Structures are given as structure tokens and as C-alpha cells.
């Protein structure tokens, strides 16, 4: 799963920015790229679920119609 | 799709913060608002899919029950 | 809903970073942790919907097969 890789990568960069808080600006900027990539990967997965739900809707509808048509 | 607009808007702001790294703090702060907006828009879409899945669950359940009831 | 709590928490931290823009670096770093947590919580919910969709797929498939088998 890429998203968990981008999340682990962001968790590392977070610890480094916090430790460095205790190089920083560049690390904050990189971390913003990590988060943006995660959001983008999540958006891709979300789009897939939306299409999957539409597919299931069509399949259920076909079954409901079949059962209506069998009653005649 | 708003989310792809907020993602494009974040991708631009990322390039600018990276180029400016090579105005910065304000750009990092704005980029944080872009990412927050994207997460919020994704949350809205995610909530819709959760409700869509519940609707499909109810529709399948009604069909399963109909088929059980037809067996009598 | 945790995600709306993490989103409210991020919205507060955003206003503070913007007001402070008008303490900042630490607030930007903390806000990055807020956003990362939101993305992670969203990922958890997204994974649940993926599994829910698979469950519905199996349920619809069982009904489609039952109806095929009844035709004999």
C-alpha cells in the first residue's frame, strides 16, 4: 500500500522536524510535499471507491429489476 | 471536482515554496490552508461514500429477505 | 467522529499561525502533525470502506448466483 508508505515517510519527517525544532524550513517544505502526496494518493483511492459503489448500485438495480420482472 | 482543484492549487503553492526555498513562511502557512481544505473536502466525499455503502447494504438486505420470504 | 475533531483542531491551529504571521515555526510544525493525524484517520476510514465494498460485492454475487441456480 503506497499510502502507508507515504504516511510512514511523513511520520519520519515529522519526528525530524520536531527534533530539529529542538534545515528546518527545508524539512517543513519537504513534509508539505509528503502530505500533499498522501492526500493525492488518498484521492485516487477515494475515486476508486466511488466508482466501485456505482458498480454495486448497477448490480443491485439489475437484481431488483429481475425480481420485479419475474412477478410479471 | 473541487478536490482536484485544491490539489492543483496545492501543487502550485508547493513549487513556489520550493523555488522560494531556492515570502516563504507566509507561503508555507498558505499551503497549510490548501492542504487543510483538501483534507476537509476529502472528508466530505468520504462521508458520502459511507452513507452510500449503508444504502447499498439496506438494498441488498431487502433483496436477501425477499428471497428468504419467497421460500416460505 | 475523530476526523472532525482533528479538523477543528487544525482549523484553530491555522488561525493561530495566520494571526501569529500577522512561536510560528513551532506552530507550523504542530499543524503539520495535526494534518498528518487527519490524513491517517482518513486512511483508516477509507480502508474500512474498501472492505465494506468487498463485503457488498460478495453479498450481491451470492444473490446473483442464487438466481442463476434457481433457473437450473
Which CATH number, 1.10.287.210, 3.40.1010.10, 3.30.43.10, 3.60.15.10, labels domain B2-71?
1.10.287.210
DSSP annotation of C6 reads H
- What is the CB neighbour count within 10 angstroms for residue C57? 15
For residue B66 the three cell numbers come to 425477499
Grid cell in block for residue A20: 530539529
Nine cell digits for residue A46: 477515494
Cα–Cα distance, A60 to C37 (Å, whole number): 36
Entry resolution (Å): 1.4
- Mutation target for A interface from B6, B11, B27, B38: give the one with most A CBs within 10 A: B38
Measure the CA dihedral C37/C41/C42/C46, to 10°. 150
Only one residue has cell 446473483, namely C64
E-strand stretches of chain B: none
Domain ranges of chain C: 2-71
Q: Please name the residues between 14 and 53 in chain B that touch chain C, using a CB distance below 8 Å.
A: 25-26, 28-29, 32-33, 35-36, 39-40, 42-43, 46, 49-50, 53
Q: Residue A10 contacts by C-beta under 8 Å, 6 or more apart in sequence?
A: A31, A34, A35, A38, C36, C39
- Which residue in A24, A10, C26 sits closest to B21, CA to CA? A24
Q: Is C2 within 8 Å of chain B by CB?
A: no
C-beta separation of C42 from C3 below 8 A: yes
Tell me if chain C has a CB within 8 Å of the CB of B71.
no
Report which of A41, B43, A52, A55 is spatially closest to residue C52, judged by C-alpha positions. Answer: A52
Side-chain-side CA neighbours of C7 within 13 Å: the count stands at: 17
Q: How far apart are CA A3 and CA C43, in angstroms?
A: 8
Question: Which H or E run includes A23?
Answer: none
Nearest-angstrom CA–CA distance, B5 and A65 = 38
- By Cβ distance, the residue of B18, B28, B56 closest to A60 is B56
Amino acid at each position: 500500500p503506497l499510502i502507508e508508505e507515504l504516511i510512514r515517510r511523513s511520520e519520519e519527517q515529522q519526528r525530524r522536524n520536531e527534533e530539529a525544532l529542538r534545515q528546518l524550513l527545508s524539512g517543513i517544505v519537504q513534509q508539505q510535499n509528503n502530505l500533499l502526496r498522501a492526500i493525492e494518493a488518498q484521492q485516487h483511492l477515494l475515486q476508486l471507491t466511488v466508482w466501485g459503489i456505482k458498480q454495486l448500485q448497477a448490480r443491485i438495480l439489475a437484481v431488483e429489476r429481475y425480481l420485479r420482472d419475474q412477478q410479471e
